[PDB]
Amino acid sequence: TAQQLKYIKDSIKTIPDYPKAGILFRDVTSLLENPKAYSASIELLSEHYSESGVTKVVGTEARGFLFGAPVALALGVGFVPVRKPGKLPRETISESYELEYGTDTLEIHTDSIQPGDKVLVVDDLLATGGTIEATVKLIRRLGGEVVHAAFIINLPELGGEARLTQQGIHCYSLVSFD
Amino acid sequence: TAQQLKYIKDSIKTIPDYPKAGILFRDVTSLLENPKAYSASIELLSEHYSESGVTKVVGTEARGFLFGAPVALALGVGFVPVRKPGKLPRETISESYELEYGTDTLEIHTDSIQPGDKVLVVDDLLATGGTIEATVKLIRRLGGEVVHAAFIINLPELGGEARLTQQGIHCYSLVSFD
Numbered sequence: 001t002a003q004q005l006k007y008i009k010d011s012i013k014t015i016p017d018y019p020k021a022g023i024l025f026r027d028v029t030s031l032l033e034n035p036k037a038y039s040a041s042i043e044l045l046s047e048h049y050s051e052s053g054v055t056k057v058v059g060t061e062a063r064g065f066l067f068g069a070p071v072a073l074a075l076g077v078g079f080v081p082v083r084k085p086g087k088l089p090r091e092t093i094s095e096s097y098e099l100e101y102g103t104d105t106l107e108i109h110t111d112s113i114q115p116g117d118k119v120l121v122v123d124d125l126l127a128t129g130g131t132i133e134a135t136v137k138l139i140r141r142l143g144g145e146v147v148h149a150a151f152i153i154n155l156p157e158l159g160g161e162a163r164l165t166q167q168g169i170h171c172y173s174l175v176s177f178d
Numbered sequence: 179t180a181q182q183l184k185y186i187k188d189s190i191k192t193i194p195d196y197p198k199a200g201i202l203f204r205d206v207t208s209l210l211e212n213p214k215a216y217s218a219s220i221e222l223l224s225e226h227y228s229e230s231g232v233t234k235v236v237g238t239e240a241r242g243f244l245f246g247a248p249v250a251l252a253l254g255v256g257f258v259p260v261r262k263p264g265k266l267p268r269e270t271i272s273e274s275y276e277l278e279y280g281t282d283t284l285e286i287h288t289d290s291i292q293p294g295d296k297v298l299v300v301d302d303l304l305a306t307g308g309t310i311e312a313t314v315k316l317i318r319r320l321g322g323e324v325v326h327a328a329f330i331i332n333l334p335e336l337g338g339e340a341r342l343t344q345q346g347i348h349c350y351s352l353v354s355f356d
């Protein structure tokens with residue numbers, strides 16, 4: 001697993017000074033285009049939970065889709081998307097989350113989660129944790145249980161991990177950077 | 179394959195009168211949340227091309243990600259995302275496409291496609307075909323060859339299939355509706 005983990009971390013490029021300057025951007029597209037690194041990352045995420053009793057996987061659009069939906073397929077469970085507003089067509093509920101310069105909302109299908117569901121949330125990267133906190137609340141409001149959230153990349157210094165802890169989420173990340 | 183196809187088509191819900199009225203919306207989320215239908219759809223898309231010589235799969239965000247990236251994983255090839263502008267961090271090129279009330283642009287990483295690539299484009303649904311035509315041009319401008327585009331759902335009466343034909347794309351769809 002250490003060999004695999006190392007190969008995954010190495011497959012991720014760092015783009016210095018993007019968008020703003022000083023910032024080191026961690027770019028997962030270089031992983032997506034490496035078939036061994038991409039399948040390794042899905043294999044490790046799905047192995048880690050292979051008998052956690054997961055009944056649903058939730059991913060937040062769009063980059064969450066890229067890791068959430070394959071994990072679901074590998075676990076053999078339904079995938080449920082959380083989207084920006086006006087994209088889901090059936091009955092939704094909604095949660096808002098403060099961004100840096102404003103607020104945004106996320107929605108989920110009310111039918112896609114029911115009491116008893118054990119839900120794994122998967123996203124590409126954990127930064128501040130705001131979308132994931134809104135996601136969690138969406139799932140909990142439909143009676144769904146979420147204890148774990150999984151990420152390819154954790155950036156701990158941006159505080160999302162700490163933040164999710166306060167909400168009672170176990171965060172699992174394949175790799176991390178500062 | 180007919181049993182499988184039937185089960186996939188049935189798993190897709192139709193929402194009458196969404197967004198506007200009269201329109202019958204074909205909602206793939208009901209398929210995503212059905213583990214048998216979702217894995218069946220990926221199995222059939224990837225089987226169909228299992229010795230077409232594909233070296234890359236391209237999907238356009240966000241709903242294209244949901245079918246493109248698992249097909250890539252199943253074929254064992256790199257996934258390459260096409261995104262709205264300002265999301266990809268490395269060097270991109272760009273293509274514009276007329277929408278109903280305006281124009282939008284799509285971008286791709288210039289490094290992710292090279293001469294010799296045989297590229298499959300996968301999306302959830304083919305309607306008018308405008309995003310897929312822009313996608314194709316992006317891939318062809320980097321020296322990449324695309325002959326096939328695959329979809330879960332074809333809505334032929336909206337003319338995208340006809341439109342892609344004129345650009346020399348073989349469209350393969352699992353199902354279709356009017």
Ligand SMILES: Nc1ncnc2[nH]cnc12
Pocket residue numbers: 023024025026027125127155
């Ligand atoms: N350094 C970083 N790389 C990728 N995504 C981020 N989101 C916030 N900071 C980031």
Ligand SMILES: Nc1ncnc2[nH]cnc12
Pocket residue numbers: 201202203204205303305333
């Ligand atoms: N009827 C329909 N269902 C889903 N997506 C569409 N895009 C255009 N028409 C559509």
Ligand code: NA
Pocket residue numbers: 110111112113114115142
């Ligand atoms: Na419910």
Ligand code: NA
Pocket residue numbers: 288289290291292293320
């Ligand atoms: Na190139």
